Amino acid sequence: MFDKHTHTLIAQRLDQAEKQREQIRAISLDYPEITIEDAYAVQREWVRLKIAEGRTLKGHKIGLTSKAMQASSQISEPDYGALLDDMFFHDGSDIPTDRFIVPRIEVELAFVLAKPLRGPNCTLFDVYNATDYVIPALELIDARCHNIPRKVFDTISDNAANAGVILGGRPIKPDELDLRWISALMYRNGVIEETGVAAGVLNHPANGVAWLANKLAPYDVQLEAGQIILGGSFTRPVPARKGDTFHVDYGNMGSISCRFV
Amino acid sequence: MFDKHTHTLIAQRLDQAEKQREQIRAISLDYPEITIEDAYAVQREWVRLKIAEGRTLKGHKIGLTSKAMQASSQISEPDYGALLDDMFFHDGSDIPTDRFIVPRIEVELAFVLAKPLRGPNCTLFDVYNATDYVIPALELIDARCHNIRKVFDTISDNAANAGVILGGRPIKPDELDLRWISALMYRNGVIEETGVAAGVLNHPANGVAWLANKLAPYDVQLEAGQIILGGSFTRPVPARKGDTFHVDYGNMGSISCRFV
Amino acid sequence: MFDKHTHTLIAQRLDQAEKQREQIRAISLDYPEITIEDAYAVQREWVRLKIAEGRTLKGHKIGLTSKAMQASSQISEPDYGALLDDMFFHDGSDIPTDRFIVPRIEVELAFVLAKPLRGPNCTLFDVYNATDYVIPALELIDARCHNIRKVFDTISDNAANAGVILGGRPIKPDELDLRWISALMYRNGVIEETGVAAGVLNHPANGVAWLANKLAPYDVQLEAGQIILGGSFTRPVPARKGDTFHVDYGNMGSISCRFV
Amino acid sequence: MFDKHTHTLIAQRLDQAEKQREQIRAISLDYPEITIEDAYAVQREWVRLKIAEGRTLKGHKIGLTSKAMQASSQISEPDYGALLDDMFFHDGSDIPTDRFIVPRIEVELAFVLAKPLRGPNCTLFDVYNATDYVIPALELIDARCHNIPRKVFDTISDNAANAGVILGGRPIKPDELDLRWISALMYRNGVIEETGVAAGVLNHPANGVAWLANKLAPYDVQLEAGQIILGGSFTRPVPARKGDTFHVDYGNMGSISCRFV
Ligand code: NA
Ligand code: NA
Ligand code: NA
Ligand code: NA
């Protein structure tokens, strides 16, 4: 573990990278001995910094769910990041492309909590009990560190690649239908680029939420009522470029659209 | 276009590559001016040779459907290959890994034809009229050429064909919306890929009509009784000795196999 | 009834059998006058020891449900065992085969309690009232005693408990008729067993009420938050290194794992 | 392969065993070199003998489907036998226990053909096209050879253990519902003894029918229109004893009952 001073410095550089839309060198290259604990400490510092600037915590996301599952990727479990108020964009809105560096769109489900979730021993059943609504959600992810390589410690430090969130479609009670079989078609500029099924997220798209509550418990942190929790992408991320229209069709769960300007 | 004898020569090399389970150099490297027409001519020659050896044509597949669709891929349209009787394995079979080189599993839908389909101007509606049943189908794809322009290699190599595994629930085309058939591909207990049938050319029947139209100028049609695989809704997943696969198509049933 | 010290001694032997993955002689052979009361006393001692070592009680299981029902089996009623935290594996996990002796997979339904259940006179309706969710659950059972009267060995051996794997679709008890939940157990791509939930004591919730009633005289109840496995709808299937399991509960989802 | 004379002799002994309700020695013990081809030839001879006596061919069954599938059984594929008119008992009827030796009840689905099925290259799709109705069916199986051992060649010779058939419940068109998920509870004397799901029969309960048509093709034999084809048991066989009542509940597919007297 590094000194807190080091964590703060790395966070400051990530912050400047985001604000200037200019990537820094991969943190893992400058800090070869960085640990997963250091990476989450950098994240916590950056989130603290951004909230001090006037932002508000609105929830969390669980990421790297596919890579955590797939056998031929070295990664052993998912990651997590914090969602801030300024990350949220309305369904059907213009997204300012110049605000981002290498943005990509992911297809997810969001859990809107009615009740807090606190670890350890948080279970899928606790998630069901605490969830007010499930709603489709797109994530816009980005990278403040250069890719050419980059590692998981860099992504985690970099607030798990968080940049944007777009909620939309049909809100449902958790018991309304089997969440495992929610499916989606991601269109970009009139063409299907990816498809996926929600079970591709950790066997059940709610599993990440309980896992997250358990990860946050040691820090005396819980998932608060009113928070929005993004469970993971059931598609590979798709690059977003200026002029692109996205339309993600979740069938009977509705759709989410946006345009990059 | 190369002369017929060159097409026969390349086909013979691919044939021995398959039989010996030993990859040859990419055809496009050895023949730098190979065309798409040459590639299909090589494929035709190889299929002819394999049928002469005692195999029987059972259908066709449409491949490279995702790449054809994807904006950032150079591939402009799908490819096709011939399905032969010895490519078919039963649901829940042990699959001999040693017979293959670098096998990968794809998740598809098969169209079992009751009537012939002939181009040009074959349409989605023609496909529906001619289809007896739709059934889940896995493809096992392979490569007889070394991996490390390259579309010509794949096409010559009978569009990567190697195996087919049918299984699950047979349905009439009109039973449900084929576009929203969804699948989870498990390997060794873990979901490796997921996908939805609309990912195959917007409608999984579209490739069938497209194929009939591609074959028409050669005085070839899709025959009654043929099985047509329309494209994969997932990226292919490597198959290795010891692997079990289970592909869950929800209410459309499942297909499983084990590599031994 | 044996003295407490004898119960402790037998429990210690079972504990070392589990830790060393080395079977001991059947307890009923070494103690020919062992009773059912002794067997549960041994189980209680072993659970106490394992909890003292740092494990936590997470629930219970009801076993031997089919034998209890079958007319041609001597077993008159089900058995029960304690489920501990280190027995639980996630859906889609690699399971370490070396940790077990002769592991077998069973197909069950779990009841996740929102409220306590206490006997005597606990009923099906009490179970429904106290259950938060029902979810598919696999059990991995094992034997710390050599196989080649014998019910006493199983009961002492914590009712063959070893592993638990939850997965699939969580439902409220009232969502559908639990009696007709059905499953296909695949191992290595092939269906080895099938069964229907009503095969568990006529209704898969019945064992939960039965268990509460068995535990009451010991001043023990089923606690809120506990996971109760009610019995297997299939015969157990051996698990060996390299095996993949996939248990398809239809619209109730699936549970999978691989033994490594 | 034995001489036809040998096949006829074995068939005659099986016939006497059935008529006298007295088991013979396992054929494989008396004929150590017997092949699967010999076993089906013995079967064909016995069926010919029984039809010459005045019986009529009503269909076929596919058996040993579970053992053919399970990894820890040596058997590689299913078996088949011929169903004769006198094997059929009405739903809800008394079954004369004295007519049988060691009878056991199996739980199956029957396919009633509207059109003939001829191999080779008969497919599941041909079965669907030729099937008029699917209906629940119980099989009563028996053994004319002693068990203490007996092998597959003995069972096949012994007309694949055929003895009885009981049709009942709800007839459906093949396309009415997914046949794979038809499920059943077998009660004997008020107690559930076995349960099972139809997919346990070769992954699809119709698969055996196409397989059978393909097996019969070399003999210039086809499955005829009007024939009843039993696809295989999705339960282990359960002994039937004098005084036993059976009730097999196929849920929304109805039930079949009988009593042994
Ligand atoms: Na991984
Ligand atoms: Na393209
Ligand atoms: Na009993
Ligand atoms: Na077998």
mmCIF file of N, CA, C and O and ligand atoms in Angstrom, chain A residues 66-77, ligand 1:
data_model
loop_
_atom_site.group_PDB
_atom_site.id
_atom_site.type_symbol
_atom_site.label_atom_id
_atom_site.label_comp_id
_atom_site.label_asym_id
_atom_site.label_seq_id
_atom_site.Cartn_x
_atom_site.Cartn_y
_atom_site.Cartn_z
ATOM 1 N N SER A 66 -17.978 -9.480 -17.629
ATOM 2 C CA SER A 66 -17.687 -10.476 -18.665
ATOM 3 C C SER A 66 -16.277 -11.047 -18.530
ATOM 4 O O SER A 66 -16.099 -12.266 -18.514
ATOM 5 N N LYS A 67 -15.286 -10.160 -18.429
ATOM 6 C CA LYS A 67 -13.891 -10.569 -18.250
ATOM 7 C C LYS A 67 -13.675 -11.364 -16.958
ATOM 8 O O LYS A 67 -12.912 -12.332 -16.947
ATOM 9 N N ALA A 68 -14.358 -10.962 -15.885
ATOM 10 C CA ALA A 68 -14.359 -11.710 -14.621
ATOM 11 C C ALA A 68 -14.882 -13.138 -14.791
ATOM 12 O O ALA A 68 -14.424 -14.055 -14.105
ATOM 13 N N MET A 69 -15.827 -13.324 -15.711
ATOM 14 C CA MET A 69 -16.417 -14.641 -15.958
ATOM 15 C C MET A 69 -15.621 -15.483 -16.951
ATOM 16 O O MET A 69 -15.385 -16.669 -16.705
ATOM 17 N N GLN A 70 -15.222 -14.877 -18.072
ATOM 18 C CA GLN A 70 -14.559 -15.617 -19.153
ATOM 19 C C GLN A 70 -13.249 -16.267 -18.699
ATOM 20 O O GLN A 70 -12.454 -15.648 -17.985
ATOM 21 N N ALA A 71 -13.048 -17.520 -19.104
ATOM 22 C CA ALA A 71 -11.922 -18.330 -18.632
ATOM 23 C C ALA A 71 -10.563 -17.841 -19.129
ATOM 24 O O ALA A 71 -9.557 -17.964 -18.420
ATOM 25 N N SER A 72 -10.538 -17.285 -20.339
ATOM 26 C CA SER A 72 -9.284 -16.882 -20.980
ATOM 27 C C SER A 72 -8.879 -15.425 -20.708
ATOM 28 O O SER A 72 -8.033 -14.867 -21.415
ATOM 29 N N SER A 73 -9.482 -14.825 -19.683
ATOM 30 C CA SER A 73 -9.040 -13.535 -19.156
ATOM 31 C C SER A 73 -8.514 -13.734 -17.736
ATOM 32 O O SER A 73 -9.124 -14.455 -16.942
ATOM 33 N N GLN A 74 -7.390 -13.090 -17.426
ATOM 34 C CA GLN A 74 -6.687 -13.288 -16.148
ATOM 35 C C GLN A 74 -7.453 -12.769 -14.922
ATOM 36 O O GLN A 74 -7.297 -13.298 -13.816
ATOM 37 N N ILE A 75 -8.269 -11.737 -15.134
ATOM 38 C CA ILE A 75 -9.073 -11.106 -14.076
ATOM 39 C C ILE A 75 -9.997 -12.100 -13.353
ATOM 40 O O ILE A 75 -10.662 -12.925 -13.992
ATOM 41 N N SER A 76 -10.031 -12.004 -12.023
ATOM 42 C CA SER A 76 -10.685 -12.997 -11.159
ATOM 43 C C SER A 76 -12.075 -12.610 -10.636
ATOM 44 O O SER A 76 -12.869 -13.484 -10.285
ATOM 45 N N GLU A 77 -12.357 -11.312 -10.554
ATOM 46 C CA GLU A 77 -13.650 -10.828 -10.068
ATOM 47 C C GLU A 77 -13.976 -9.476 -10.703
ATOM 48 O O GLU A 77 -13.100 -8.856 -11.302
HETATM 49 NA NA NA E 1 -11.755 -14.525 -15.786
#
